[PDB]
């Protein structure tokens, strides 16, 4: 009977909330007491990437903190250079609607998917120098929202359909299917050990998936609207979220609770991208009001503002060494801050 | 110069990637993008067949101009989370099944879709080429069963051209942005070869406004 199970579900969710409330000793705002403040952080643009000619929807740094990748609304995909300002490669895309990028940890592959429900993976370090499709991943029913790389042999994709998929490259089919969400899944971020990732849906819940087992471990409710951005703490024991509520939350993976709510009265625009800086002290956020922000982590006080664009900032991301940050907005210019 | 031999060649490579990127951006910018939306089984098949999973596009050319028809209506997702991907689209070809009024009625749902798409923040400047198809079925259905069931506000008589104009202005009066955009209504059926001519006439009229705005005459 439906009533013989919905009552049990409500009771078990109440037990979940009670168990959460029992383990909440002190809020992290009370724990970070009498602590040296970060102070205002000065952030100047170092490079400006003036190649694209349309709206930039995604971006991903490499592992050498040297190259970039961008997905503009045109049928192109530029693999930028960071210390200098040149273009390593330009990819003529098969579908102008693209919302995803993923740079290989070894730099040999780039993922690319959008509204076509197809994840196109592009081989870079190839004889007969040219960038060709390694595999055209098929098996999704909605638009693919974000791509991640475990290695050169695996890829984790989050799509509009209420599921996440872990793919294989030798055979282009899925190996696990994380079908546990409701609503469109918008963002995800892998872990330093690449064993767990959390996907963020439009039902305002983040679920911690287990790559090896293929089953969900924890669900993170308590957030208001649909969430569009997730990045882990560099320790891999916490993750931020970004919603259209104009509020960010820093959860944890060992208490399953909330630690900070990152909201301000003057901001009403939703968050589009979230990326921690190294050491986890900072929280960068890609807002919609033509502007970014850098929130301090241990105390939710806001650090220096980050405004260099005139349109919606879609994506941003810190390098793997913590050196630079590249904000890619809806205007065709990226901006590598420092 | 303070640049290496490989660095100068890298700058050369970047510069010609810029040139080949411009040679494609200028080519694609001249092409017209026409988003095609509507209701489920609202006659999109016959119209995508008339003018020559995910998003399925079409490239039909009339009077030497390359068009693009993005049929993203077969997506089955939250429309508000990918509708911002269609910034700068020249027009939105919206199609309403006229004869589907006596069929939980769904023209009210389509009207709610129209007033949510025309008043969207991303589609303020984009015009809507509103289509009204299955007029042959609508004519017979008006004579068979009265139309006043759907609209309690309707009070007119049993005239075909009267009812068609009534629902036309009912759909037209759904926008709160009465000046920033225009709605080009049309009546069409299967036995009509004038649809492509009408949409070309509308796209010429809207690119006239587009380039007048680009020069800042408006």
């Amino acid at each position: 009977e439906l009533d013989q199970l919905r009552q049990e579900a409500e009771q078990l969710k109440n037990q979940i909330r009670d168990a959460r409330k029992a383990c909440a000793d002190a809020t992290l705002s009370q724990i970070t007491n009498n602590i040296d403040p970060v102070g205002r952080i000065q952030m100047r643009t170092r490079r400006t990437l003036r190649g694209h000619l349309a709206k930039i929807y995604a971006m991903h740094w490499g592992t050498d903190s040297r190259l970039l990748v961008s997905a503009s609304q045109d049928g192109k995909l530029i693999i930028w250079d960071s210390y200098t300002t040149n273009k390593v490669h330009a990819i003529p895309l098969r579908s102008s609607w693209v919302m995803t990028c993923a740079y290989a940890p070894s730099g040999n592959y780039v993922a690319c998917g959008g509204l076509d429900n197809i994840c196109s993976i592009y081989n870079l370090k190839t004889r007969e120098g040219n960038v060709r499709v390694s595999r055209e991943l098929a098996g999704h029913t909605g638009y693919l929202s974000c791509c991640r790389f475990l290695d050169d042999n695996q890829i984790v994709t989050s799509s509009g359909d209420t599921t996440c998929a872990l793919w294989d490259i030798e055979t282009g089919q899925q190996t696990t299917t994380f079908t546990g969400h409701t609503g469109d899944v918008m963002s995800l971020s892998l872990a330093p050990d690449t064993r767990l990732f959390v996907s963020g849906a439009c039902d305002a819940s983040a679920k911690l998936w287990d790559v090896r087992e293929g089953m969900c471990r924890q669900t993170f409710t308590g957030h208001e609207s649909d969430i569009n951005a997730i990045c882990f703490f560099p320790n891999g024991n916490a993750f931020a979220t970004g919603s259209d509520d104009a509020t960010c939350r820093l959860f944890d993976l060992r208490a399953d609770q909330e630690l900070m709510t990152y909201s301000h009265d003057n901001i009403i625009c939703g968050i589009t991208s979230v990326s921690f800086s190294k050491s986890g002290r900072l929280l960068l956020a890609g807002y919609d009001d033509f502007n970014c922000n850098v929130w301090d982590a241990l105390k939710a006080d806001r650090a220096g503002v980050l405004a260099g664009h005139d349109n919606r900032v879609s994506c941003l991301g810190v390098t793997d060494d913590g050196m630079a940050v590249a904000t890619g907005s809806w205007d065709s210019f990226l901006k590598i801050w420092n | 110069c303070t640049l290496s031999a490989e660095d100068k060649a890298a700058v050369e490579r970047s510069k010609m990637i810029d040139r080949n990127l411009r040679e494609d951006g200028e080519k694609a910018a001249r092409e017209v993008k026409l988003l095609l939306l509507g209701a489920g089984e609202s006659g999109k098949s016959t119209i995508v067949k008339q003018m020559k999973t995910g998003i399925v596009e079409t490239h039909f050319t009339f009077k030497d101009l390359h068009f693009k028809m993005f049929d993203v209506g077969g997506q089955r997702s939250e429309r508000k989370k990918w509708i911002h991907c269609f910034e700068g689209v020249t027009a939105i070809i919206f199609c309403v099944a006229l004869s589907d009024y006596d069929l939980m009625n769904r023209m009210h749902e389509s009207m709610k879709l129209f007033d949510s798409i025309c008043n969207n923040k991303w589609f303020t400047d984009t015009s809507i080429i509103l289509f009204l198809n299955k007029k042959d079925l609508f004519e017979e259905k008006i004579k068979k069963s009265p139309l006043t069931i759907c609209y309690p506000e309707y009070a007119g008589s049993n005239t075909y051209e009267e009812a068609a104009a009534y629902i036309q202005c009912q759909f037209e009066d759904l926008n709160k942005r009465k000046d920033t955009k225009e709605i080009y209504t049309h009546f069409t059926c299967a036995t009509d070869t004038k649809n492509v001519q009408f949409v070309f006439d509308a796209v010429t009229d809207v690119i006239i406004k587009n380039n007048l705005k680009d020069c800042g005459l408006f």
Partner: single-chain antibody
Amino acid sequence: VQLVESGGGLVQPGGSRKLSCSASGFAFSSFGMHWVRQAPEKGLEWVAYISSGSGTIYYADTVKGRFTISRDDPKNTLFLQMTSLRSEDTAMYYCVRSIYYYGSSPFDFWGQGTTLTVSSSDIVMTQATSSVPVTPGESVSISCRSSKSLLHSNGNTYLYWFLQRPGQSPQLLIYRMSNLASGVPDRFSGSGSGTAFTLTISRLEAEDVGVYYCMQHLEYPLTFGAGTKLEL
């Protein structure tokens, strides 16, 4: 894949000939083609260069202005016309593929070469190792030396390495200092500092026998080094 080059033969001095190769198997329009010659009993000698789309054309001091080079992207071919051939121009002319982006492998593929026989302030790469005997399973550190600090201010050093088996086209080994081109075993590991470089082989088999030339790419005209004959 292959770069077959055609032209040359028994020629008389002064005669003008066109050396052409037909590229087949890559994006010829995206590769900056080169032209490297080798005298019948001497080392390599740079000749010319064309960037992608014929944007940049360079020549060596010997062939400066006297030879004309060009490319034809639609036909996937590379051209180089000689004028006033002299007896000091006999060589085997190799067509060298090269691409220049970050982390690329310039001078990766080398053509088979054409036989040319006509009857009748620079960087110097010093390497005196020649007729040196080698036994399989041993380790040989082929020394090298330049006349200019190849360590540019932009971090990396623009020194390459190449291998030439007896009777075959040259092959790239180490595309910077302390790198390794694709298709090369990890036996070869470069090690250099300033104007002193060595190609360290941890353990060598019986198939990697030949002559090892060094070549700077800091600035043109891309000087080479002498031969290094590893005798079995």
